[PDB]
RNA sequence: GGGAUUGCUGACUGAUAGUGCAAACAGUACUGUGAAGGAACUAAUGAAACUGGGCUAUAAGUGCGCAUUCCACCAAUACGUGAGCAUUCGCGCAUUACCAUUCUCCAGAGGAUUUAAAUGCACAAACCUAUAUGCCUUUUGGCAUAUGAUUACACUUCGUUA
């Protein structure tokens, strides 16, 4: 039914969905999941599909691997995940390259690996 | 969808119906008397104070052979 | 946008055109491992044109962890666009190769050589001798003492790549030792079978066989293999030892050192049925024919396997399987019945002439004397004699004549053109004389009129005597006997005297000389005329042939 | 005949013509059958082939001198018969006969008499179809003979990179520096070399 | 091999369910369509004993209505379909029995459902 | 699903039909600022309306051109080319001549009817382009697991020498 409910989107939710489809690979997507809010009216013949908009913050994480801070856009729950499994270094090492659906996470991942390898 | 791809398809479509300018091309040929179209000339200089200066190295030079008189090859071969 | 993303997008390209785009638009954006990943993903993305034969209906579990669900048809060709894009991309990769070869380890070079060997196998590039040397240097300089660089898998992949590439290398003499150093430590069973296949097709390593037998036997079973790998192991031991045993195949036997491994392989291949291909069982049956290995219920299972796919088999595979079940003496009645019905329902029954000769021999030396087999041997004989226009060898005619002489083939109009083509090819470089002796045995299985090559066979045998570089076997007097009994020239007694003076043959060949002693110039010179009288061979017409040389032998030949 | 022309399937897939030009033929059908003639020209059309014979299918042609009204002259002319309407006359009984394409020795194909012994004396000779030779009427001015036109003048032995083959002539060295035997003096006269020379001479005087 | 079987140009247009006829009527062996009498579900206090006894009986449909239902294709032999399960030896592999799903019977709209219950077809409301 | 060759494919159409177009130049002339709309026209024959005058007042032959099958040269494995109306109740094209005798309304205008044929229409045949279990499918994809985020590994082996 989901392929139907995407086609039943109100124009603000549809424009927000197009922007989500454009700028997904620009921000960190650790455990982030987009969601539709379809509300069910009991006096029937009305199913209004919308979007549950994610919340975004520009947190400045300190990398304990290489001596700098990086700024990068995240959600609350992926910040929970990163700061509750060990930090940016442990996340960028132990989450390999495909659960990262993100470009700056991949770039800082390569910089952590290269700087750490030259640090050996 | 790109700009160059559309222009190339337009030129390939215009490759057909080509030759001696029939149809709409007869009226469209008169655009050269309406919008100052630049022809296929080679530029020989540039304006500095509004006076044109021909650069002498861009003047036309034709490397004609030493003698084309009593040269033993003609434009026609005998059958 | 980064380099690990480029590596992972090369690895998960899922189409060869996508990989072509990534290689072409990011030429300066590469490094060593990007090129290595591109070469690794090259042979996996080739596609074939509609001749993909499904195996989902044959094995209930679809993959044993790695296979293609549709294997191929024998003789299938690639898609034309995919072949063009793959060849252009491989030329692009060979262009981008030496700028990044310097930072390689033995792993990347091993995978590159193996993958380009796969591309040569598929027919993409077929040459590869543009730049193969810098890869050899980067995998050989850092593996001279088995140094800190990688090992184990890379030896098998490098040697498999050189197996598929050939090239007649120099580091075989260097890599003789680190290969045999490291079987028993860091090689799996598939690595062992690729390495023994590569040593087989380079014909290089004979002391490496029995330790590899012991190593892959001390592994928990051979059941961690899959049936084409078992077929390659049989083929490897065939091409490395069976030609040694046969040349210092119905008389071929095994040696006791390798039979336990051969039984382990046969038990594995009968355990892993529902997974086995016609080419695999063709090579397995041929290797068991060559090695002289006669297992119980193994050819029954392999004949059942080719019975289960007989509309899907090309006639080369069927002819190979029927030869390997004819040389190794075995009867498979459903397979013979199905093959006979299949090419008796076929209205225009032509194929390659060697396949006709192979089916003729297979039905000849096996107990198929039913009416359907007589109709089949007549049909195959007519379809072959319609196409004796080959200048290859008399060997195809030799198998055809062995099949026609095992039967009592008496159809004269076939045998006339068979004899005409035999004498037409006989003036050229005929390799052997038994290849003519089979034709003579066929042409005297039934009645024939073949003087025009009987004189030529006499000329060839006198030429072999004048050469003085032949066997002078009892088959020499067997060549003498047929042309002697049909022809009468008188110069043929020199061979029958000189070879019989150095005889090395006791019975059933001096009777041939005694029966041929009327047409030749030898009147009566035989100490063995009484020894054959004490032997009573009773194969030739010696009773009517001893009526002019030894009257006691005339009674001894028939009574 | 049919008036469509393009609906007709094109005949003569293998190009072989039993009737040739300049030969005696018998008219089989039409306003004059039983008469004979000599073929003047065969119109080899794959869809509608015609044959024009000598003075048989005569119809008046209204040749139109260009004019709006009735100003024209009329000339009798042989109308084209269909190719199928005619057949070759054998020289023995004067009746029409079928020509076959028999092969004689040397691999050549000739036109025989349709007999079970097709050999010499049954071959009908076919004349050549071309005689436009400009070889007679050659050697006019502005022409070159074939032997002169086939000279092997070109050789790749020379033409190698020669950046210093200048010889230092004002612009006759510019062409062999850009990669040339002799420029005409008139060509160098076109790019005037005397504008600065006159100013130099006037300053000197 | 000019075998032309026109797979396209076959639409398989949907036919109406007529689900409102399932539990109300039933067909007998002779072909007669029977139904239970109405006016018996509630308000039984305001009715006489003979009237309530009379309304418990079933009556056949009138011939005109029965003819329309028979032509429409109504052939229901049972009030509700007997479950293929509940037969001994024919039971669910993992379900202890199954979930029944009691069914409702309202369906009437002039745009989409039940063309039998509307005189004409109403066009939709502006489609957003 | 899509894009081009072939159809001894068509109880498809035959010029107001069939594509919008069978045509020297049809997505043309022309219309519109523009996006966009969008014609007519084959070759003969020459119906009616209309308007003047007059009046009344022998299901056959014969030629060509091919296709089928025979033959003899063949790449020698599907036919490869070539003599032959040799063969076929084959196909296409070409061709078949009457000679009076006046009691027929005539002249124009117009382009219907009749005849002819796919380059039109619909498909068909090869050709090229585009992971497994089960739920819902509905000319096909959404959902958990497994060889799995990994730059690495099995297979098309031609065998023939009693
Ligand atoms: Mg039309
Ligand atoms: Mg019209
Ligand atoms: Mg229309
Ligand atoms: Mg007309
Ligand atoms: Mg009229």
TrEMBL record, chain A:
<dbReference type="GO" id="GO:0003735">
    <property type="term" value="F:structural constituent of ribosome"/>
</dbReference>
<protein>
    <recommendedName>
        <fullName>Mitochondrial ribosomal protein L28</fullName>
    </recommendedName>
</protein>
<comment type="similarity">
    <text>Belongs to the bacterial ribosomal protein bL28 family.</text>
</comment>
<dbReference type="GO" id="GO:0005840">
    <property type="term" value="C:ribosome"/>
</dbReference>
<keyword id="KW-0687">Ribonucleoprotein</keyword>
<keyword id="KW-0689">Ribosomal protein</keyword>
<dbReference type="GO" id="GO:1990904">
    <property type="term" value="C:ribonucleoprotein complex"/>
</dbReference>
From TrEMBL, chain B:
<protein>
    <submittedName>
        <fullName>Uncharacterized protein</fullName>
    </submittedName>
</protein>
TrEMBL record, chain C:
<dbReference type="GO" id="GO:0009507">
    <property type="term" value="C:chloroplast"/>
</dbReference>
<dbReference type="GO" id="GO:0000963">
    <property type="term" value="P:mitochondrial RNA processing"/>
</dbReference>
<dbReference type="GO" id="GO:0005759">
    <property type="term" value="C:mitochondrial matrix"/>
</dbReference>
<dbReference type="GO" id="GO:0035770">
    <property type="term" value="C:ribonucleoprotein granule"/>
</dbReference>
<dbReference type="GO" id="GO:1901259">
    <property type="term" value="P:chloroplast rRNA processing"/>
</dbReference>
<dbReference type="GO" id="GO:0003723">
    <property type="term" value="F:RNA binding"/>
</dbReference>
<protein>
    <submittedName>
        <fullName>Uncharacterized protein</fullName>
    </submittedName>
</protein>
<dbReference type="GO" id="GO:0044528">
    <property type="term" value="P:regulation of mitochondrial mRNA stability"/>
</dbReference>
Automatic annotation (TrEMBL), chain D:
<dbReference type="GO" id="GO:0005840">
    <property type="term" value="C:ribosome"/>
</dbReference>
<feature type="region of interest" description="Disordered">
    <location>
        <begin position="111"/>
        <end position="147"/>
    </location>
</feature>
<keyword id="KW-0687">Ribonucleoprotein</keyword>
<protein>
    <recommendedName>
        <fullName>KOW domain-containing protein</fullName>
    </recommendedName>
</protein>
<dbReference type="GO" id="GO:1990904">
    <property type="term" value="C:ribonucleoprotein complex"/>
</dbReference>
<dbReference type="GO" id="GO:0003723">
    <property type="term" value="F:RNA binding"/>
</dbReference>
<dbReference type="GO" id="GO:0003735">
    <property type="term" value="F:structural constituent of ribosome"/>
</dbReference>
<dbReference type="GO" id="GO:0006412">
    <property type="term" value="P:translation"/>
</dbReference>
<dbReference type="GO" id="GO:0005739">
    <property type="term" value="C:mitochondrion"/>
</dbReference>
<feature type="domain" description="KOW">
    <location>
        <begin position="18"/>
        <end position="45"/>
    </location>
</feature>
<keyword id="KW-0689">Ribosomal protein</keyword>
<comment type="similarity">
    <text>Belongs to the universal ribosomal protein uL24 family.</text>
</comment>
